[PDB]
Design a protein around this ligand. Structure first.
Ligand SMILES: NC(=O)c1ccc[n+]([C@@H]2O[C@H](COP(=O)([O-])OP(=O)(O)OC[C@H]3O[C@@H](n4cnc5c(N)ncnc54)[C@H](O)[C@@H]3O)[C@@H](O)[C@H]2O)c1
Ligand SMILES: NC(=O)c1ccc[n+]([C@@H]2O[C@H](COP(=O)([O-])OP(=O)(O)OC[C@H]3O[C@@H](n4cnc5c(N)ncnc54)[C@H](O)[C@@H]3O)[C@@H](O)[C@H]2O)c1
Ligand SMILES: NC(=O)c1ccc[n+]([C@@H]2O[C@H](COP(=O)([O-])OP(=O)(O)OC[C@H]3O[C@@H](n4cnc5c(N)ncnc54)[C@H](O)[C@@H]3O)[C@@H](O)[C@H]2O)c1
Ligand SMILES: NC(=O)c1ccc[n+]([C@@H]2O[C@H](COP(=O)([O-])OP(=O)(O)OC[C@H]3O[C@@H](n4cnc5c(N)ncnc54)[C@H](O)[C@@H]3O)[C@@H](O)[C@H]2O)c1
Ligand SMILES: N[C@@H](CCSC[C@H]1O[C@@H](n2cnc3c(=O)[nH]cnc32)[C@H](O)[C@@H]1O)C(=O)O
Ligand SMILES: N[C@@H](CCSC[C@H]1O[C@@H](n2cnc3c(=O)[nH]cnc32)[C@H](O)[C@@H]1O)C(=O)O
Ligand SMILES: N[C@@H](CCSC[C@H]1O[C@@H](n2cnc3c(=O)[nH]cnc32)[C@H](O)[C@@H]1O)C(=O)O
Ligand SMILES: N[C@@H](CCSC[C@H]1O[C@@H](n2cnc3c(=O)[nH]cnc32)[C@H](O)[C@@H]1O)C(=O)O
Lengths: 421, 421, 421, 421
């Protein structure tokens, strides 16, 4: 509605509430605040244009404003059509960020807006899911040589970009921010663990304790989702295709079965595979009446909605972010958040302190691209662990935690080999 | 605004959304559904008038509709001015329940509406905090003849009523529903454990893991809040006045210290004491910058607001359900939900399956009073344990769980003494 | 072998090692040490004779020596033929305690020794399982009028004594020490939780994580056994006959099924029912090859050994405290500790700090019997909660823990009823 | 005492008990049983000579017998002077393994026996701490021609060997078995987590719940020790030098502080660093009376014994595997197992099912060296991940667990980039 050359938002009059959300979470983001103070002093992004595809809530907004405080000209598009928070996006538009996003936008608008964000002709692309980096290579090839590099937030995006590199069509360097220690060990595990159940509880008002919770995938996200589900009193069943991770889940005290056996007994199903069709026709047919299904992975393809639609004689919407599929025999199965990221659609995403660290790495990755892209090949890179170390020490210090320091004798001992029994 | 003899609600046009909310949670309340079918078949409350003071959200609405389906004429008032959900109440007014409640009620409206609810001339009073039963004894003594009895939902109300009995001011029988095994072992512990953190995450979007969570009170609510806080990754510090429960918290793996020591290190404070001034002036003075405070117990007197106001040079409202008290030294302390029941004010209360068992007991208590008021004395009773077992057996059956049966030989062994060795 | 009028022990030359065990655990028993200092000063048991039936390890020995330091003449017999520690018992004999116990003694010696302990003509009987109190009523009735009272340590004994009271044959007062808050909330739960797995690991050297652990009974012992099993990485399945406790186990995150379904899937079975024949023929027939079975309840009747013997074509003993039952189809099932208390036969029983509190109550119960038995009927009593409070405050102080104290305003508030919304 | 050219053991007559111990744990080692049948059928080590330095208990004996069943001639020496179990070693001598070990070995005997084990002129060396591989490089350089390669079991040894490679002193290939997923994710974490507390309870009979447990090091062992300590009811304090791992411990719910601060409040201290002097003079000076200290890492240098001896006015031995250092102010600090591997010295090491997977990898590593030594360089290698997957699949199958299979469509999706949205 409020839609022009510089932005396309639902309603600019929502900006005051968006500003309050941005100010609130920024009070609990000490690492990005530390970085923002440096950016304001040195203005390292003066004259630099940045286009970002991220989940457009208040922590994302604070990162974009941090990049702007460093001198950058920033455009932004949504990483998911349903995760955008309209009031936050109005505040971004008021701040001069060229943001193009409306909550609930269509898939075609999702890409029409992504193109508009790309119109800034970015030097740096910040991506979440690799849609924007892929879109440039497919439909905006005229702009490739102007792009220094990109940084990718999530596992699904890194998988896509590595396949792009394998096929020889990646045309600029990419930082796999997801692969940094202070990202996947914290965001993917602890962040997703809390916010997935935050969203499921918010959407349903249902009890987690005494439920059979089925977690499909025992990677970093599945681990955290299973961890916190157990912490909320649930009986957790893990479904995995990796035999090593399946044994880990056993040692962690969780049941391990395949997806058909899990489908018969699960009360709540959560997918975190980054894969396609992990739950489909024959699993829905086995599910108990009232089964809750949620996706915490990527896009909307982990739980195969077309199979649910073919089984349903009625499709209803009893609550916001709850789609009811009524089957022939009268069973009703419930899909949360239209099969999209339940933590970001049914809730407010990861907590502020988690995205502080993930978006601190993103800020450092943008600086790394700015300053090293000419020595980098069109390949996927991981940030040096020194940046991980810096983010961790800033967080610990803001926490008031002082850790042991190695003595010179101990450093010597760890490099030696003669001191045995 | 939509106010009359039979109801007083904010907006009747919100009823359609309220109905969707009631329909939803009712799908996950099997025990109360079992009872509603019995009530609908037999109509045990035909001609009976029931006045209820409860937290007016969707699970409460299904309890009130279940009583109406049993033939009762039902009036309803809010148990807390900020827990009422206006769309649910609109649906109750449309359903013929004489409900008088608006979210954000003044204290004067709170008691005016409770008086309007009493105008039904009830035979049975269902109470939640003992305000209504106290109000009849103070201001509506002409109602005492017609009143068969009352039922009290919560710990705080039962304490008040037992005190009224001790002083000899109680005039009609009272069922202490809170004292049923199927209530305080589940509602108070598991329900409050989940819904307290549901509300805290919803209000703040902050990380629970790696925080110092201080839980004041290690009763049934405190146990649950502490258990789920640990499940979400927090370090938990328990503050108690009972030495036995303090040792229980230690053995459960939690730190135990006094309120002053806890105030210095806590990041999030949760009170669940049912007592007054468990966090007060001297504790606020010790708290770290950015401390989060929330009350999970009765009323709003556990965290003493007047002390916060006197310390504050500025009182701000950065988020819905977050009050910011800025102190002279620049520190900011955040009180959630105005110091009232954080699960019911900042979220949707206990999950549906928990309220199913609690309100099943309430429905049984109302039927118990109906069937026994001529045999009861003006004192506090607890439901026979056979009702607890019925509720637990209906729930287990609806879960598809069948448990081991105690054999006749085993029963006789348990009543013998000669078989030792 | 070293067997006379004053004692019957395996070998007095083992006393030096027994003294060291007694000294060791006594360093970590601050509550009983506190009581012992009082006893040494006041000598309240001067001229009093005490006969005890307890598990004769080093914590029991310290209680008996504490009673002796108070002036008592003490005799002792084993509460279980397999839990006696011969070196501890030699030290007791060297100390002047009239102890009659040899590890591995027969059932007939178990009672022959119990009679010898009774020959002291006790004023006070301290019992664990009610064998001695029952033996007096059956076979030593000539001595009843000389006995002031008894105290019973465990749930199984209290069950027997209450049945004795019901039948009208209990002839002196009995203190149900097991029923004290500081007993069953700590000994039965936390003590049994740790020491059961202490014994199972010691006997087997097998992994607990990633195992299906079946806990039969979800009372105080079963809760703790399930708690700690989960803490060691196991998948815990709870078998219960109480529907309320079955739901508790669900809410605590454990599977709940009946014993036939549990038998098919369990890797380790632990009984804590205090009942007879909870695991029998048809369950053994369903068990997987290599199933481990252990009893943590009472006697050796919870797992029905006669059924295992009838199924076995070979009975072997591959490890100390491991009996192998080789079945017709080649399956091998393993019973720990001959079906007796696995924590006390395969290990060293509860940890010292736990039995500090249980045996502190026992010392206070003996004092309570001494001083109140003439005002007591031949019935089962529970100690006043003031003693529970005293034990808890001594433990907290020895721990360096200072708890909140109620203000006079708060005490007033909890007795009031007028202060509502 | 029973010493000769082919073996040196304490007492050959202990062999019968050693065999029972080997037979027992072998029943619960399915993966190594699977490999032993393959080895027995194919005899891949016919004519091969293998010298091993391992902790000589029953699971090690089954590994050595499995290699012998494959046709290998096997010599064995102790990996630690106090972890050897004399009856197991007696059985190995009876079985034809050239084992030279006695529990309680002097340091001189330790290296004399390791030299006797090397007299076999091995083709493959299996090492556990890199003492033997270091000893060949220092004192048996004439052996270097015939040596195909070595395999290192543990973190400390791999560090030594990688340092030897860096300095260019390594002369033959080395397999870093510790670096296999199926090893360090399970042995180091879950195995050490259980067996450390197994040993601590066995030595002390003290309560774990409600204690302040300080874990020094949050690597794989530290993670496991902390996780199981929390599972047993303790409050866990983590001391780290890695800032990333320190934040992991916080998010896992543990307190994080430096060694001096932890020394003031810890009740039980466990070191798992693989480093020297992580607890030393200044820390002992701060410790509470009665502090328990134990080492779960390499050698006995993590807790610096010489500092304890200098502080002590008295050194006593109140229990087996408990050394008491009485300080000038009367405080008593207790070091378990002489500061050596507490799980292996005060207990029976890792449980059998854990060592099954670790020693399956060792058997595969020995076969790998046999099959690849002519293609390898004098540097440190890690086994191909296909062997990890084989071990995990054999274990899952023996558990009756069948996991979901990755479909061809899903594999192709994971190698694509065009499918976004
Ligand atoms: N806020 C969020 O919701 C959030 C945060 C981080 C990452 N993610 C997304 O979550 C997904 C995974 O995150 P990760 O970092 O855990 O990936 P990961 O690869 O660590 O874990 C993936 C696991 O999925 C398992 N898997 C794949 N197909 C499967 C199937 N059909 N059935 C069962 N298990 C299967 C794999 O074996 C692997 O262990 C990605 O899509 C990532 O983008 C979401
Ligand atoms: N939905 C909800 O939020 C919900 C649900 C159930 C109960 N409640 C309310 O929660 C409160 C307690 O519920 P309960 O069932 O736990 O009561 P409970 O009495 O079991 O626990 C109360 C604990 O508070 C401790 N306590 C009292 N004053 C204290 C102080 N000054 N400092 C520290 N500890 C103190 C007492 O020792 C007691 O153990 C009541 O007000 C009850 O109505 C709220
Ligand atoms: N050191 C120890 O091993 C130790 C310590 C304390 C008590 N105990 C013994 O443990 C036993 C129980 O201790 P408690 O204090 O837990 O008793 P408790 O009564 O609290 O729990 C007993 C549970 O067993 C359940 N039960 C009974 N028969 C059953 C069956 N056939 N199948 C399944 N569940 C069944 C009951 O429902 C009850 O919940 C008693 O024999 C007591 O003496 C042993
Ligand atoms: N059966 C056993 O007891 C067993 C089993 C496996 C490994 N280990 C031994 O345990 C040790 C570690 O095993 P790992 O696999 O955990 O190593 P790891 O390196 O994963 O963990 C080591 C941790 O120690 C930390 N550290 C180093 N010096 C420190 C100090 N001074 N203070 C605090 N933290 C410090 C490092 O930061 C690192 O995180 C090695 O010696 C290994 O051989 C023992
Ligand atoms: N954009 C795609 C891919 C999944 S996004 C997953 C990413 O979201 C990120 N994330 C989680 N919570 C938040 C938040 O509150 N703000 C911004 N990003 C978030 C997190 O870093 C993770 O890598 C989609 O919606 O399906
Ligand atoms: N008088 C005080 C305290 C009583 S409320 C505490 C009660 O609220 C109940 N409760 C918790 N969640 C819900 C809900 O969603 N609907 C209705 N009652 C609830 C719970 O049973 C508990 O006993 C006040 O009203 O604010
Ligand atoms: N004597 C019977 C009944 C069970 S005894 C169970 C009791 O043992 C007690 N107990 C547990 N550990 C110890 C210990 O180390 N010493 C003495 N008593 C113990 C505990 O208090 C519990 O009530 C039998 O052996 O079957
Ligand atoms: N060189 C040092 C540290 C190496 S031992 C650490 C290794 O012991 C192994 N281990 C643990 N329990 C057992 C057991 O019962 N038998 C054999 N090895 C074991 C485990 O795999 C780990 O990598 C020393 O020998 O004392």
């Amino acid at each position: 509605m409020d839609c022009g050359k510089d932005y396309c938002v639902k309603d600019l009059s929502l900006a005051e509430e968006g500003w309050k959300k941005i100010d609130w979470v920024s009070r609990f983001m000490p690492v990005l605040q530390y970085i923002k103070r440096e950016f304001e002093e040195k203005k390292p992004f003066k004259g630099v244009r940045i286009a970002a595809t991220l989940h457009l809530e208040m922590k994302t907004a604070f990162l974009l404003l941090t990049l702007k405080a460093g001198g950058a000209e920033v455009s932004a598009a949504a990483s998911n059509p349903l995760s955008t928070q309209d009031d936050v996006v109005a505040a971004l538009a008021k701040a001069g960020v060229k943001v193009y996003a409306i909550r609930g936008e269509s898939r075609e608008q999702y890409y029409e807006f992504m193109h508009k964000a790309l119109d800034i002709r970015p030097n740096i692309i910040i991506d979440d899911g690799a849609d924007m980096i892929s879109l440039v290579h497919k439909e905006r090839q005229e702009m490739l040589d102007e792009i220094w590099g990109g940084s990718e937030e999530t596992t699904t995006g890194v998988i896509r970009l590595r396949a792009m590199e394998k096929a020889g069509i990646l045309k600029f360097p990419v930082i796999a921010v997801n692969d940094s220690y202070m990202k996947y060990l914290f965001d993917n595990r602890y962040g997703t663990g809390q916010s997935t159940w935050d969203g499921i509880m918010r959407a349903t008002n249902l009890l987690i304790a005494g439920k059979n919770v089925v977690v499909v995938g025992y990677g970093w996200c599945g681990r955290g989702i299973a961890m916190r589900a157990r912490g909320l009193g649930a009986t957790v069943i893990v479904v995995e295709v990796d035999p090593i991770k399946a044994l880990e889940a056993r040692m962690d005290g969780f049941l391990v079965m395949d997806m058909k056996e899990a489908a018969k007994i699960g009360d709540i199903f959560v997918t975190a595979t980054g894969n396609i069709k992990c739950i489909r026709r024959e699993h829905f047919e086995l599910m108990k009446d009232g089964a809750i299904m949620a996706n915490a992975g990527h896009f909307d393809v982990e739980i195969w909605k077309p199979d649910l639609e073919k089984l349903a004689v009625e499709i209803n919407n009893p609550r916001p972010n709850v789609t009811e599929y009524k089957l022939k025999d009268g069973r009703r199965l419930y899909l949360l958040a239209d099969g999209r990221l339940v933590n970001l659609v049914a809730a407010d995403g990861h907590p502020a302190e988690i995205m502080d660290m993930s978006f601190a790495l993103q800020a450092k990755a943008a600086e790394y691209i700015k300053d090293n892209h000419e020595r980098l090949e069109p390949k996927v890179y991981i940030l040096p662990r020194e940046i991980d170390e810096m983010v961790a020490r800033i967080k610990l210090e803001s926490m008031g935690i002082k850790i042991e320091e190695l003595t010179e004798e101990q450093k010597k001992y760890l490099e030696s080999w003669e001191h045995g029994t």
